[PDB]
Design a protein around this ligand. Structure first.
Ligand code: HEM
Ligand code: HEM
Ligand code: HEM
Ligand code: HEM
Lengths: 141, 145, 145, 141
């Protein structure tokens, strides 16, 4: 589980992100689509060229979900439940894909917040996203 | 591996990378973020906290060794397999590092390039480096097939 | 790949194999145990329960096609990369199956072999088939390199 | 994070296992060492040859842990917490290796339960093993 130091690191890291959550979400998605093209095939109804309205709208929503998680660290299984239903039962996301969005987010955060992204913040953020994915892959098993 | 223009995009970026310091940091972050990997480096001394790992002089020495072999790969991208022959045999038929961990260090390194270079390390450039680390991962893994 | 002895052990054992039904049972068990893989098989019909998958005619038929190309590979152990080059294009570029799933199907087929052949399917023999299914995994994944 | 027909299946399938758990623990371990040789490194102090008392002993205690798990399908995080601490903090078992033991077990089970290992039972057990595995990777400093 996330330690009290993790909880402060994550909250603080996401604090800096602040208003820019949505932009970073859209960037993370784009870094995921390009770097791992298989992931594109979950979004065949999207126009996935750089700057597209649908990627931008989706990025805003992924961001809002992670912001909501950052408020509720002592309960990620609970507050993300309804999302684990969607991803697994409806969309059927291969469980391997989640680590990819996680990686892409880390690269995004690192790009924009170099002086915040110490090794220990890197670590707690990874832990935070490992926690999220897990919940999101919950509804297999 | 890559096309003759992709290779150029990559070689053009890497010439700006400070490989020694990316190396020290990347091995560092790996050990901090993914603790099970520390097992392979118990003989490097104290690794008992983030600061301990990051300031470990041997972790920094080895970091550089890992990145120098990287840079070297960059120079032999058409034949990554043959270039990593001995190290593929070292990690597998001796160190027994599971191939998954190649991918991880690769990703940690790409995280470090992002931190070191910011918006210069574009999505497009990243994806190009993403298949380099995959390629390096394939060559070190190869001795398992 | 497989030494002279290995090729012959695996091959002797494969003559015993009821390939058609193992094919149908492996793919069926794939869809039940790892629900996500159904996403590639929407158009096959009702895959909404164990009973549904296991009595789905097209799952039976496709199972056989899958295991047939696998038994073809059993005759091309030295050239798996080559044997599977067209299918690698199908799965990678058209279907976009993540190469991990080649391993899950491999593993699942191994379970099915185990269920059909019981204690004749010795630790050693299984280990030989683990290499074979890992070889099939590679050749199928290769055009992602 | 399981079912109920699952729980019934798991107990039932463990029932027909019986006094053979200890012996099926050792087989699976053997199948794991042979099929996946990198798992041998966790046991450099073991005689790893067929029939060895060291494997036997260990197979027992593996089986006995799972026997306990079947007993507590409603609180796996709580009941297996100590083992998880052990595997991660002391043992540093690469989380990738848990998959390979589970598969080795199923193979083992299938070898001895041909008419009691239906797709449905396969799913249930694999689900159970995955719950078990998830708990044993859950502490990671
Ligand atoms: C960090 C973990 C993730 C979070 C927080 C997240 C968040 C979300 C949210 C909030 C939605 C709802 C969108 C809506 O209500 O319209 C959604 C939908 C969706 N997600 Fe995720 N997601 C994550 C990971 C992934 C991954 C890794 C993939 C696969 C690459 C994926 C594929 C999809 C798809 C295809 C949709 C439906 C798109 C649409 O029709 O708008 N998700 N996700
Ligand atoms: C792209 C990935 C990697 C590359 C290019 C790489 C490269 C190298 C190189 C150049 C050496 C030194 C060769 C020598 O002096 O003989 C080395 C040694 C070593 N590597 Fe790696 N390596 C990689 C990943 C890993 C990973 C993921 C681990 C484990 C988590 C690992 C564990 C070790 C260990 C324990 C040594 C020897 C340390 C010692 O001598 O005390 N390596 N590697
Ligand atoms: C051992 C690994 C595998 C082998 C040997 C294999 C082999 C084959 C073969 C022979 C075909 C038929 C080509 C033809 O009809 O000419 C096929 C098609 C197909 N495969 Fe695989 N395959 C493997 C893994 C997978 C996996 C793991 C998936 C899903 C995750 C998959 C998804 C598909 C799909 C969706 C089709 C076409 C279905 C249709 O539209 O009728 N394959 N594969
Ligand atoms: C369902 C999965 C597993 C269960 C239930 C389990 C349970 C156990 C138990 C009960 C012990 C012995 C504690 C004692 O001596 O009383 C143990 C120790 C150990 N485990 Fe696991 N384990 C599992 C998976 C793994 C895996 C996947 C690995 C790595 C490949 C691993 C590596 C080890 C090692 C090296 C020991 C110490 C051996 C000794 O000194 O006797 N375990 N585990």
């Amino acid at each position: 589980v996330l330690s009290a130091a993790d909880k402060s690191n994550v909250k603080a890291a996401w604090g800096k992100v602040g208003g820019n959550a949505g932009a970073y979400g859209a960037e993370a998605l784009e870094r995921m689509f390009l770097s791992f093209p298989t992931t594109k095939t979950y979004f065949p109804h999207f126009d996935l060229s750089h700057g597209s309205a649908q990627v931008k709208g989706h990025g805003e929503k992924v961001a809002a979900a992670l912001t909501k998680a950052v408020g509720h660290l002592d309960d990620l299984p609970g507050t993300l439940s309804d999302l684990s239903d969607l991803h697994a039962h409806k969309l059927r996301v291969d469980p391997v894909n989640f680590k990819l969005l996680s990686h892409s987010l880390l690269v995004t955060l690192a790009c924009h917040l170099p002086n915040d992204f110490t090794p220990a913040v890197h670590a707690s953020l990874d832990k935070f996203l490992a926690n999220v994915s897990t919940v999101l892959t919950s509804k297999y098993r | 591996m890559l096309t003759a223009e992709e290779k150029a995009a990559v070689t053009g970026f890497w010439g700006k990378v400070k490989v020694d310091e990316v190396g020290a940091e990347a091995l560092g972050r790996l050990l901090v973020v993914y603790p099970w990997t520390q097992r392979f480096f118990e003989h490097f001394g104290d690794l008992s906290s983030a600061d301990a790992v990051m300031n470990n002089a041997k972790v920094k020495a080895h970091g550089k060794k890992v990145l120098d072999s990287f840079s070297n790969g960059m120079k032999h991208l058409d034949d990554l397999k043959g270039t990593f022959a001995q190290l593929s045999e070292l990690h597998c038929d001796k160190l027994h590092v599971d191939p998954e961990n190649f991918k991880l260090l690769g990703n940690v390194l790409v995280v470090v390039l992002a931190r070191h270079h910011g918006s210069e390390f574009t999505p497009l450039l990243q994806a190009e480096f993403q298949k380099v680390v995959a390629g390096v991962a394939n060559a070190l893994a190869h001795r398992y097939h």
